[PDB]
Structures are given as C-alpha cells and as structure tokens.
Amino acid sequence: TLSAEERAALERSKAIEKNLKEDGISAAKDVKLLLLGADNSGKSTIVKQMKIITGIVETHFTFKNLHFRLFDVGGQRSERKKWIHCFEDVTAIIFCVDLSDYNRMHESLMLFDSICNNKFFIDTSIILFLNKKDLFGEKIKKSPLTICFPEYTGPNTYEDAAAYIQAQFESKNRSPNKEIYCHMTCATDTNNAQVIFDAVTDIIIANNLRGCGLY
Amino acid sequence: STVHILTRISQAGCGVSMIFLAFTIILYAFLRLSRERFKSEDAPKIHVALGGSLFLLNLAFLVNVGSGSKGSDAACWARGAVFHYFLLCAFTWMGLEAFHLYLLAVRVFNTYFGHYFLKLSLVGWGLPALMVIGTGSANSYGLYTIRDRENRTSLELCWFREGTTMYALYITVHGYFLITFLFGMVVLALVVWKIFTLSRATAVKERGKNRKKVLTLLGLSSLVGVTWGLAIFTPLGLSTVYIFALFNSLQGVFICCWFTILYLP
Amino acid sequence: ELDQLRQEAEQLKNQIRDARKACADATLSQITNNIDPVGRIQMRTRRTLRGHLAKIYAMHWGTDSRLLVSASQDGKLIIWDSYTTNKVHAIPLRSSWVMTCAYAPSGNYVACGGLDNICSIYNLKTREGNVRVSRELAGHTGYLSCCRFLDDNQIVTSSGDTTCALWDIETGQQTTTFTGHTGDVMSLSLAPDTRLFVSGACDASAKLWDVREGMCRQTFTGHESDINAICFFPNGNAFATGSDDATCRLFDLRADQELMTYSHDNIICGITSVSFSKSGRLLLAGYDDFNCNVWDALKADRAGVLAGHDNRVSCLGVTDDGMAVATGSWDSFLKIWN
Amino acid sequence: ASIAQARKLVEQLKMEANIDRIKVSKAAADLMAYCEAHAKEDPLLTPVPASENPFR
Ligand SMILES: CC(C)CCC[C@@H](C)[C@H]1CC[C@H]2[C@@H]3CC=C4C[C@@H](OC(=O)CCC(=O)O)CC[C@]4(C)[C@H]3CC[C@]12C
Ligand SMILES: CC(C)CCC[C@@H](C)[C@H]1CC[C@H]2[C@@H]3CC=C4C[C@@H](O)CC[C@]4(C)[C@H]3CC[C@]12C
Ligand SMILES: CC(C)CCC[C@@H](C)[C@H]1CC[C@H]2[C@@H]3CC=C4C[C@@H](O)CC[C@]4(C)[C@H]3CC[C@]12C
Ligand SMILES: C[C@H]1C[C@H]2[C@@H]3CCC4=CC(=O)C=C[C@]4(C)[C@@]3(Cl)[C@@H](O)C[C@]2(C)[C@@]1(O)C(=O)CO
Ligand SMILES: CCCCCCCCCCCCCCCC(=O)O
Ligand SMILES: CCCCCCCCCCCCCCCC(=O)O
Ligand SMILES: *C(=O)CCCCCCCCCCCCCCC
C-alpha cells in the first residue's frame, strides 16, 4: 500500500467496489418471476405488453415504477432438477394453466405437484392463473367435467366446475407458509398486471412480517 | 421505612431487566462476530439499539435511586439530566422502530436509503440531546420529593424540580410519550388498512395469512404502549412499585427472548 | 436379429466384469494399512474475498497461483488477486445465469457459460483498458456445465445435451464431438498432459476420452446417483469423483476399476466439488451440509473439516503449486484456507 | 432405427473390451510411490511456518 503499483492496484480495487455497490443497489429493485406451466397455456402472453427482449427466455415489462422480470424456462429440454436451483431467488412462481384443454390437464397437475413440493421452492408463493375461461364455459356445456376428472360428481355448471378445478389445484399445497394466489383470466379481454402487482406486494409484505418474528 | 421498600424493589426489578438486556447485547456481539452477512442487516441494529437504550435507562435509574438525596445540587442536576436523556432515548427508539415497520409494511418497494442506520441512530441519539439541552437551559432539574398523601418523604429522587409550574415536565415527558404513541398508532393503522385492502384485491379474502399476523402485531404493540402509559401516568407510590418492577422485568425478558428466537435458527 | 445382439452385448459386459474381477487381487486398504496416517489437519481462513452479491457457482485458480476467477448469478465475473484481496477485474456478464468459469493456462483469456447455451471467451490482455467479448461459442443444445482450456486457442466444454465438444476459439466451430453418454455431462477434468480427459454425467458413469482421436477409451460405473464432481490424480493415472450418494470413489485408468470408496454414516449430502492436493495425499470434497471435508486419499479416514460457510459450498480448487484451497459458496463469500 | 445405435454400441463395446489391464497391486503400489515421493513438497500436507506462506 506504499509503492506506486500497489497504490494503483488499490485505486482499481476501490473503483470496482464502487461500481459493484452501484449495480447491487440498481439490480435489487427488480422483481424476479419464474414462469412455469404446461405449453399452449398462453404463457407467452400472460401480460399484453411484455417487450420480450434455445435457453431461458426473458421478458421485462414495467408497471407503476417497478421492473418485473419474467423468465420462461420452457425450451431448456434438460434435467430440470439439475438447474432449477438457479431460480431459488425468485419472489413468486407464475403458473399459467389452459382450462379449455383436457389432455394437458393431468400433465399440468403433475407439474404443479412436482413444483409446489420441491425442496428449493418450499416457501416460494405461487400466482396460479387459469387462462381461457370463456372457451371453458363454452366447452363445459357440450363435454362435462367427468372425462377429465372422473371422481367429480357435483353440479355441471361453469362456476362449480371452475371452483372444483381450482380446489383440485390448490389441494397440492401440503406446506403451510405458502399461499396460492389463484385467479381466472378470461385471456381475451383482461388486463392482469394489477393481479401480479397485488400478489407480489402481499408476498413481499408477508416476507418482511415474517422477518420481524410474526408467525 | 417505605424508602427501604421502594428502593429495594425498584433496584431488584431494574437489575433483572439489566441482566436480560446484557444477555441480548452479548448475544448480538456474538452473532455479529461469528456470522457473516449479519453486518448488513439493519433490523437487528435497531433492536439492539433499543435494547441498549433500555439498558442505559435502567442503569441511570439505579444510579439515581441508590444515591438519592446525597451529593451537591448541581451534581444530581446532571444526574437527572442524564436520566431524562435516557428516558427520551427509549421513547425515540420505540418511535424509530415503528417507522421501520412503516418502511417494511406500508411502502414496500424501493426502500433503500444510503447510511440508513447512521441516520436512524443520529435521530434516536440526538433528538433527546436537543430536548435535554433545552430543558436544562431553563434550570428545571433538581430534587423531586414523593409524599404519598402523607406529606412524608416516601422516596427522595431528583427528577424535575417542583417550582409551582410543571410545564417542562409535562411538555418534555408526557408530551413526548403521547407524540411517539400517536406516531406508532398512526403507522399501525396504516399497516392494518393496507393489509385489509390487499386482502380484497388478491381475491384471498379470509384465508390470507397477513390478516392474522397484523392482528397479532397490533395486539402486542398496543399492549407495549398501554403498559408504558400506565407506568408514566400513574404516580410511583406504595402498592404500585411491584407492578412497575414486574412490567420492567417483562419488558426486558420479552426483548431478550424475541431477539434470541428471531436470530438463532 | 435385435435380441441376439442384446445377448451378445450382455455376454460382452459379463466378460468385462469377470476380467475386472480377475485383475483384482488385493484391496487398496489391504496394501496401505501399514502406512502411518496423517495427524489432525486444521486449516485457517487466511483471506475472505467479499464483493459478490448473489450465489457463487464456479471459481478457478490461475496457473501463476495468484489470481483466481469467480462467477456468480449476479452477472459479475470477478478476477481477484488472492494475495491482497484486490479485485483486478469485474466483467459484466451478458447472461446472469452462469454455472462455470475457466482461466486459461496463459492467464490471457477467461471463459464463462451457463443456461444460455453459449461459452463466451473474454479477452484480458487488450491494448486499451477493456475486456471485450472475443468470440461466443454456440453449438450446443443444452446448458454448459463445465469448460477447460487446453491452450489459449482450444477449449473443451461439456453440456447438458449429453455431448462434450472440443472447440477452436479462433474459428468458432467444433473441431470434434465427444458423444456416447446417456445422461447429460455434468463435469469434466483435464489430464496433466492435456491429452486425455474424463467426464461425469447423470447416468452415473465416468468415461475417459481421447482428445486427438475423439473416441471414448474406457468407462467406469460404481456410483448410484448423479456425478457432480471429477478430478484427475496429479500423475494422470487415476481420478476421484463425487456423487449425490454422499460418497466419493477413486478410479484407476490401468486396473480399470474402482480402487476405494469414501463414505461416512454422518454424511448423506451430495458432493458438490472435489480436488486433490499437490502430492495427491489429500482429497478435498465440498458437500451440501455447508462443510468441506478433507479426506485421507490413501486411508479413507476423515482427516479434517473446514466448516466456515453458512450456505452450500459450490466450488473448490487447490492452488496449482499446492499452497492454498479456495472454497466458494452460495452465501457469496470465497475463503482462502491454508 | 435403433439398430444403427445398436451396431455403434456393440462396436464401441468390443473396441473397449480388448485392452490391456494390470493388477490392482501394482496400481496401489504406484499410488503409494507417488504419494511418498512428493510428500516433502506438499504445503497443505505438512504445514509451513508463517515466514514462507504468502497467505500469512
Ligand atoms: C429536529 C430538531 C430541530 C428539533 C429541536 C427541538 C428543540 C430545539 C425545541 C423544540 C421543542 C422545544 C421545547 C419546548 C418547551 C420546553 C419546556 C421549557 O421548560 C421551562 O422550564 C420553561 C417553561 C416553564 O418553566 O414553565 C424548557 C424548553 C423546552 C424544553 C423546549 C426546548 C427546546 C425544544 C426541544
Ligand atoms: C445530557 C447530555 C447533554 C449529555 C449526555 C451524555 C451521554 C449520557 C449521552 C450523550 C451521547 C450519548 C451516546 C451517543 C452515542 C452512543 C454510541 C451508541 O453505540 C451507544 C449509545 C451511546 C454511547 C450514547 C450513550 C449516551 C450518551 C453518551
Ligand atoms: C456530545 C454532542 C456531540 C451531542 C451528542 C451527539 C452524539 C450523541 C450523536 C451525534 C452523532 C451520532 C452518531 C452518528 C454516527 C454513528 C455511527 C453509527 O454506526 C452508530 C451510531 C453513531 C455512533 C451515532 C451515535 C450518536 C451520535 C454520536
Ligand atoms: C419503566 C421505568 C419508567 C419509570 C418512570 C418514569 C416516569 C416517572 C415520572 C414520575 O412522575 C414518577 C416516577 C415515574 C413514573 C418513573 Cl421515573 C418511576 O415510577 C420508575 C419507572 C416506572 C421505571 O424506571 C421502572 O423501571 C420501574 O422501577
Ligand atoms: C456502562 C458500560 C457501557 C454499557 C453499554 C451497554 C450497551 C449500550 C448500547 C447498545 C448498542 C448500541 C447500538 C448498537 C449499534 C450497532 O450494533 O452498530
Ligand atoms: C418522533 C419519534 C420518531 C421519529 C422518527 C421519524 C423520522 C425518522 C427519520 C429517519 C430517516 C431515515 C432515512 C431517510 C431517507 C430519506 O427519506 O431521505
Ligand atoms: C419489524 O421491523 C418489527 C416491528 C415490531 C413491532 C413494531 C412496533 C410499532 C409501533 C411501536 C410503538 C408502540 C407504542 C410506543 C410507546 C412509546
């Protein structure tokens, strides 16, 4: 710390430390959202204005002076258990589900089962969407909800079927201290950035109130 | 000799609180040394600073009660000034912890300010400094006798002196407690309102988790407030020293167990 | 026609297994019992290199035994100076999701890659004061799990598409492709003479590869679970591996079979990294219980433990001259032990 | 179909089959020899005093 070369070295160390602190405060104000879900469930247009930007795909829409970063981890086609711990630092797991389909329903349910009970994602909250509600309400009349869920025998109605499906999804929690902020997006005439905003705010408030002992 | 009883009981309760707050300070030093990443958290700093403020307040109260009615006048002039300073420090630290709760549960996003704990500590240790400087500029400290309806000296202390007008005492102790309690209750009301508004937008009305956490936080904070209100506004006579010592012991133990459960996995 | 080929392959693997059983006359412990063990080894945290914001996924020592690289999910590739904890560089990564870093044996280049399926090569000895992305290598269909420079002009990288590939950093295209794995390749390790290299995959098999020939030579199967870590022996005639079964195993390139196993009942966490000492007497292995056990590579006795991290210890590397051991971790604090 | 990879697999397996192997005793002896011929140059195996280690 006396010679010229060591002095210049310490100067470079300090300039780099300052840049690191600047980027560390500039990058912590974004929200990271892991975007799971079976394919063709409208996960590519969960928000109308995303401004997107094979591996992990990013989309970075902004809303109410806050930067949301959405990572679609479909397309990796590798061992999910081997790189899923990259995303242990996300705030919430968005999870789109296509209601108008019947073959992808059990795949979606099994994927949700595997995710909601992982060891890295055991306290990360889920924001479960349910896309294409109107097409479901149109299809439910012609095809009852028994060719998809045989154990179901309640009344054949839009409301009862949708509530039963949502209950079937939410019944895989198996781990309190994590809530499933469900929602039913019509996928045609909906503006659901506010749903993400409010669910994220509640997640972060719960995260902080649990940092002050509250349990 | 009621002086004996009052002195001994106040001393014992104060000492138990001192023991537990010292345990808290020691455990904070151990946690800060033995673990990285604990130096950047600011909530434990606010907690340990409030604990230390209560510890020093207890120490000042012990010094006053033990050596009352003895020494020169301008000596425990400064003694009472110090005791007032530490009382106002405890109050300002409860207020600053309410403000921290405001930053965590009302304004949730973009709450990063450089030198956060520096500014908090500056406020919490230098606002009572101005208060005491002012209060002393008028020579308001001195002896303070407690009669207990008999006009007999039940306990000699040298809190604010009796000069037929107590504007200083009420404006700078009771008024400060009320201002801080009001700030705390306003912040708690804003927290409750925000939680019960979000409980409608997320469509999870009853199941919501925060609807219970915030009610528990309110039920504890209002208790912590009303117990200090009862401590201040009621006069320290006989048959009410036991309750005060017990309140102090519990105010110590709760801080100790809260800090040792929150920061030991 | 298919079934008879299956029977022929089964008979061939039986012949291989019986040959390996016939070559095994005495166990390694039976030979090394008469050696006096190492005393208790207590290493102390000399330095602590802080400055990373997110978890640290890979580090790598320089050949000059002084500088080391670190990569983290915060998107920063820092090139430290371990002597005076002096950040020589900090390169901003284009992709925040990186799982490996490499440091050329000349000290002039640094490589990085991860979930973006690309191995970028960052120059260091530029004329001006800058570190520009020299050449991006994109020929894989899966995340890159490891990379290792041969020269400052050739790099061999593994990936999650089950195939390793030797590149030509000057051109930008694969010069060879090493295929034959079933699961995806998780780690590789270069030989001291940089002519061979081993590789572990999630099919619980470690295969020896020939660089110039592009063909596989041998294969080893002792583990049950995935293989995360692999490291050659200092003389290039053995290697140890790490697995999620909480055991490390020493394999041999001549006897063609496992020589010894490193297990303990109090250990049920998966090995995250392995590395040898300068003479090969110590076998370091970073675990998931946040500790870093230092094994006795000839006695299988747990010599010492380096418990200094609060989260999982992800990377681990012994200095090229055997001076220190730098164990990165997920709590973002590298530590130099000695 | 899978017959192509079947031929490739049986070819690689037969190629790996006919290789030269030695006894485990010899291999263990060589590991012993290497671990005992470089024991004096192991700064982690045998500690060095604080006057030599650059990370003192
Ligand atoms: C953020 C910073 C700038 C706040 C600074 C506050 C102080 C500079 C002022 C604000 C309220 C004032 C106090 C209001 C009234 C009193 C009571 C007064 O008591 C008396 O002895 C005079 C009246 C009486 O004796 O009856 C002495 C001054 C004091 C403490 C004042 C002191 C000076 C204070 C603390
Ligand atoms: C009565 C007024 C005028 C003077 C008061 C002097 C003493 C009692 C006051 C004034 C400054 C105060 C200190 C300010 C800073 C610190 C450092 C902190 O980490 C512990 C509290 C501590 C140590 C305070 C203790 C009480 C203190 C020393
Ligand atoms: C005696 C005069 C100055 C009045 C008293 C002023 C003192 C008590 C005030 C003014 C500046 C304040 C300090 C400002 C900065 C820090 C550094 C922080 O890490 C701990 C609190 C601490 C140490 C504060 C303690 C209280 C403080 C020292
Ligand atoms: C918790 C603190 C707060 C102290 C009071 C501050 C206000 C005061 C002003 C007065 O009018 C008369 C006396 C009191 C009410 C005080 Cl000084 C004493 O009675 C002792 C108390 C409770 C305390 O020190 C104890 O711990 C109990 O022993
Ligand atoms: C009578 C001897 C001195 C007794 C001091 C007891 C402790 C009082 C202050 C407690 C800690 C102050 C705030 C801590 C802030 C920090 O940790 O940086
Ligand atoms: C009246 C007692 C409680 C007083 C506490 C309320 C005021 C606290 C002020 C602390 C400042 C914290 C950092 C401010 C950052 C900023 O807004 O620029
Ligand atoms: C989170 O950071 C910790 C919050 C714990 C509760 C905070 C209490 C807020 C209001 C305290 C005021 C109570 C009455 C004050 C009497 C002077």
UniProtKB/Swiss-Prot annotation, chain C:
Keywords: Acetylation, Disease variant, Host-virus interaction, Intellectual disability, Phosphoprotein, Repeat, Transducer, WD repeat. This is Guanine nucleotide-binding protein G(I)/G(S)/G(T) subunit beta-1. Guanine nucleotide-binding proteins (G proteins) are involved as a modulator or transducer in various transmembrane signaling systems. The beta and gamma chains are required for the GTPase activity, for replacement of GDP by GTP, and for G protein-effector interaction. G proteins are composed of 3 units, alpha, beta and gamma. The heterodimer formed by GNB1 and GNG2 interacts with ARHGEF5. The heterodimer formed by GNB1 and GNG2 interacts with GRK2. Forms a complex with GNAO1 and GNG3. Interacts with ARHGEF18 and RASD2. Forms complexes with TAS2R14 and G-proteins; these complexes play a role in the perception of bitterness. Component of the TAS2R14-GNAI1 complex, consisting of TAS2R14, GNAI1, GNB1 and GNG2. Component of the TAS2R14-GNAT3 complex, consisting of TAS2R14, GNAT3, GNB1 and GNG2. SMART domains: WD40. PANTHER family: GUANINE NUCLEOTIDE-BINDING PROTEIN BETA G PROTEIN BETA. GO terms for cellular component: cytoplasm; cytosol; extracellular exosome; extracellular vesicle; heterotrimeric G-protein complex; lysosomal membrane; membrane; photoreceptor disc membrane. Changing R94L: In MRD42; decreases receptor-driven G protein activation; decreases trimer formation with alpha and gamma subunit; no effect on protein abundance; no effect on complex formation with gamma subunit. The keyword Acetylation applies. It comes from Homo sapiens. The keyword Flavoprotein does not apply. Pfam families: WD40_Gbeta.
Swiss-Prot record, chain D:
Its main location: membrane. One of its GO terms (cellular component) is heterotrimeric G-protein complex. GO terms for molecular function: G-protein beta-subunit binding. One of its GO terms (biological process) is G protein-coupled receptor signaling pathway. It comes from the Eukaryota. Transmembrane segments: none annotated. Expressed in fetal tissues, including testis, adrenal gland, brain, white blood cells and brain. The keyword Metal-binding does not apply. G proteins are composed of 3 units, alpha, beta and gamma. In this context, interacts with GNB2. The heterodimer formed by GNB1 and GNG2 interacts with ARHGEF5. The heterodimer formed by GNB1 and GNG2 interacts with GRK2. Forms complexes with TAS2R14 and G-proteins; these complexes play a role in the perception of bitterness. Component of the TAS2R14-GNAI1 complex, consisting of TAS2R14, GNAI1, GNB1 and GNG2. Component of the TAS2R14-GNAT3 complex, consisting of TAS2R14, GNAT3, GNB1 and GNG2. Component of the TAS2R14-GNAS2 complex, consisting of TAS2R14, GNAS2, GNB1 and GNG2. Belongs to the G protein gamma family. Guanine nucleotide-binding proteins (G proteins) are involved as a modulator or transducer in various transmembrane signaling systems. The beta and gamma chains are required for the GTPase activity, for replacement of GDP by GTP, and for G protein-effector interaction. This is Guanine nucleotide-binding protein G(I)/G(S)/G(O) subunit gamma-2. It comes from Homo sapiens. The gene is GNG2.
